[PDB]
Symmetry: D2
């Protein structure tokens, strides 16, 4: 089969690969719709996850089941399914410890395009079908459903890790697709004021659409200062880091209140470390908690998020600015996440 | 001064009481708008809190500060304020333990109409003005603001105690004002499916408006059985008990999943005890957690909820079905909470 | 293969059954040491598990693996293992939802002598060996190791569910083996005062050994009243229900502080329900949380507790008062759990 | 009155100030025994707090109440009390928010020798006596009681923040008094393996006494590498930062498992910032939570820890290696926390 893979760090292209075979508990799926992620640009042109060779990219897709193992009971050929980007090995001590995202290793719950051939191929492999797939509702637009697989689960996890309280004030740094879902998630956790930080006009409008009450541009003065001004020097209760460089950690620390929580869902693919300003972190005694985690995956998570969409808790259509028809457009679509044009949030390639 | 008080069990009427005086940290406030509560009914016509004599009723009001103690720094005469029904004594070991609602005693955080003269008087006393009051926004309708003091904080507390997860399935038993805010709060905590239980026409519509995806009526078969069918034998993740008799606990236990949480915010006014069905509670080993708590109060809570209304996170106007002008209407309004006409949800008396 | 089973109601006796075969991920184990449980006595002499046709009893044992399925990778014949009484199916949505104990059904994580032959047989079946077994340390006395499989995990789970704080006052109702581990677990969560409730001398001394600072005899006065006397009418922070009748719930609600937590680890098998005293439960608004759950099982749980024993965090030898050397002494021991002498806590048969 | 104070940054000496006067809710206390803390050495010869003008030092004391305001109800002249180093303003929004330690400002809950005159004076002021004092048991040794005020509450808070689970593996970096309490606290939260890092012989022996199962000398090599060796490359579940410089944060991240928690109670008064290693922090998605907070204070905390000592949950006598007798020794004592000989842990000057 054919697949669009990374031909080593800093290089990519279409390659020929043997079609994967399903294990007793797995399923082979052919994509019906896929989307490129900024994370795949970190992995390729930054090698933030180490080197790789001939690894088919992509981890955001909805498709049709073509083959299932002899032990698969809840899925069969013909089923259209939503595939979370995180497909953990449920039989691991990490799962028993409460962290499905790290089953058998740090980040190992996320396989597709991490270390396992991705969804940008005529067919792809899903480990443990019954535990990692969810049925795609018949009336659900493909482009919308693809947003559940990574953007929605990641942005919401940002809101979940933030442990938001009814009326909490929240700052979401970065209003790209992940940041927009962080805003939506924060609103769906009861947040009062929500301050989104970004400049790309299209993202600014979506930010407000999802719940932002204030929008700040990281080019009108240090974001910390702006936030303090807006909050009368009181700061905010929570900060979700969803975009920008590692310096955003310091900014988050300076703008969050003592006792607050900073939740990172931004995949930092460059630099040796992230700095915590000593003074503003109360010399390590300000109870300014810092969290950061990979998005949850698996069937339960996908079914729960899917159902929220079906119940109109969030409108994912606003995330998709670019829709293409035809496998060949995957190359160009991915390159958009690298060049990032002004009118782009997320792109979906419908096969 | 005059006030509408409980002349004793089953007796209501206007009486004279000395005008309250503020201590160093207190404030004397005159009501601008008030609302009667079903709780006032449990206390009077059922002595749910024990015998009382000439206690002014009511605990839901927005008003104007007339006098403040010498140590009050953040409030002054003339200030328009939102008064949370729960006004805790912040200097207590219970607060130090994390439960403001029980400062100096079980339910002692709630004073108005519990054991302290209520807001149905020409003037009422608010302990610790700086810690228990919030400014009423200049553009906020008085009837809407009154809904923050009890209905919103209570219903939302139901959702908070329910520890809702993104996409959780939730059943709210009872769709009166409190149940409606429970539905709104559940959606604002990320709930997917929300099943409201009620039949009153106006309440049914408000419930769907606040987030209910399904509506069930008792007069159509045992509620627990109906829910089991709807969830195809699986049950729901969470249950918020907002209204009805004590037998609703058994209903909640039967419809909730193992590991689920039952959140009670219903003020049970009669009966010796509440029953838990042994079998369905997994003989006490099914991790079906049961919570039950008094709504939070105090300045922080009121300001956070106030701000949620300002940022249109919830529309409180749908709760007020009846509006009266004139202090004297308090009697008629309070009686409606007793009669419960099918077109009533909440009534507000604007002085 | 022979094994002491429940012939029928009030009927016990050895029987002949075919040796269970292992599935690809299972392991067959032969007992090295086992222990009768109060739950064994109730399933038979009380039909607390309906009617079972020739079901081999027992669910507390440590042993030697004799066979493993083709897909088992961490265990092999000859391995000595600790077998947690709860061996759930790790591939289920309940597990993805955070409740291993109820995987594929309420209390379904508990299989041995529930709907699967128990450990009182020459050989027994363990589902998913890699996820549900833990190696038995070389120099760990067998009697102590068996106490891990249920007494330790259950008692400690009572302390875990109680969400004990440093210096918290705790009451453990019932000082049988489970209550003793509840006492030890509470001390291991930092409890200050620990009040044990029971009457048998052997248990009273053991309770003090594990951490009890006060002892109350339930036969000499209403327990809630005695607790109020010990606490100057203030009540306690937490209550762990580990014994006695279901009225113990009412007693627990009456002695616990508002905002407190009641943790049930006792199997309630009589009557149609448990009662919550309305008044003392603050009419359902006292924030007196009620929890109850089957002990966690699985490999991680077993290795973690095992290591606590290895690092001498708890001395389990005090739980074993009767040690038999012989495979046939199983019937004697089980009946020894029925007639329950005053000098018995737990009996261990080292075959 | 006299006393030892911080006559500016880097300059010490006894100054003459007007004996403090108690307000309506305050109390004046005469020290019976006090102890110097490394924390003051910082504020002084490091200016980690900024600049201070004539601030009496010391915040670890047990004393006699000699004067109370007209509103104090639970304490009176003659009472012997335990004074927590942290004495919050319970009437603040931060308290309403759940953070007593930062009432009215970051770290503002901590007054003595922060911005308020300390206890190294003939008499000191205690804000809100009823809310911030605890009775000293008559049998409890003075030197032991002093250890409660800061060392115990801080070390235990380190264990609390770490959210330790039964059987968790824990590493405590630094074994000075605070770290020793962190070890004792970790053990009292159910920890299995506890690895202590330090070299002072007296501290190492105290580490083992309080629960340490392994001891590591950071001078031997990168502690993260030593820890990985000890745990066969698996890392540990939790880390408590109680000593060393800001680089210990990186070491903590490198030795803790994904999903683990890092708890800082170490007061970092030097350097621009602490670094988080990008790769080992899973690029910010490894769920390696980082917390850090000032110790809790107030009456409830003091009474709970006091009771733990009374019930022998922890033996504080091991922390006191130096005992003097004379208010004039205070000066000498504090100097020990500066040079710090290898046979000293904490010093107590009895008056
Ligand atoms: Zn992605
Ligand atoms: Zn009310
Ligand atoms: Zn058992
Ligand atoms: Zn200190």
């Amino acid at each position: 089969m054919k697949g669009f893979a990374m031909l080593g760090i800093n290089k990519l292209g279409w390659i020929e690969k043997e079609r994967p075979v399903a294990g007793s508990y797995d399923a082979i799926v052919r994509p019906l719709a896929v989307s490129p992620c900024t994370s795949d640009i970190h992995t390729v042109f930054e090698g933030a996850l180490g080197d790789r060779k001939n690894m088919i990219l992509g981890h955001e897709a909805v498709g049709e089941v073509v083959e299932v193992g002899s032990e698969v009971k809840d899925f069969k050929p013909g089923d259209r399914v939503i595939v979370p980007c995180t497909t953990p090995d449920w039989r691991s001590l990490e799962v028993q410890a409460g962290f499905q995202q790290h089953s058998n290793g740090m980040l190992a719950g996320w396989k597709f395009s991490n270390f396992k051939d991705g969804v940008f191929g005529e067919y792809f492999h899903v480990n443990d079908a019954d535990m990692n797939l969810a049925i795609l509702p018949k009336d659900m637009p493909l482009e919308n459903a693809v947003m559940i697989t990574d953007m929605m689960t990641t942005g919401f996890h940002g809101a979940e890790l933030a442990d938001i309280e009814m009326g909490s004030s929240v700052v979401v740094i970065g209003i790209g697709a992940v940041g927009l879902m962080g805003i939506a998630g924060a609103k769906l956790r009861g947040a009062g004021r929500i301050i989104g930080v970004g400049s790309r006009p299209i993202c600014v409008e979506a930010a407000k659409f999802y719940g932002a009450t204030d929008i700040l541009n990281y080019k009108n003065g240090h974001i910390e200062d702006q936030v303090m001004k807006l909050t009368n020097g009181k700061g905010v209760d929570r900060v979700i880091m969803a975009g920008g460089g590692s310096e955003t950690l310091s900014q988050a620390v300076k703008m969050v209140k003592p006792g607050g929580i900073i939740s990172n869902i931004n995949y930092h693919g460059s630099g040796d470390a992230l700095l915590i300003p000593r003074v503003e972190w109360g010399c390590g005694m300000a109870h300014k908690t810092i969290k950061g985690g990979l998005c949850p995956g698996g069937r339960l998570r996908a079914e729960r998020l899917r159902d929220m969409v079906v119940y109109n808790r969030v409108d994912l259509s606003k995330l998709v600015t670019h829709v293409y028809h035809g496998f060949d457009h995957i190359e160009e679509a991915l390159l958009l996440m690298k060049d990032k044009p002004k009118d782009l949030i997320k792109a979906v390639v419908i096969l």
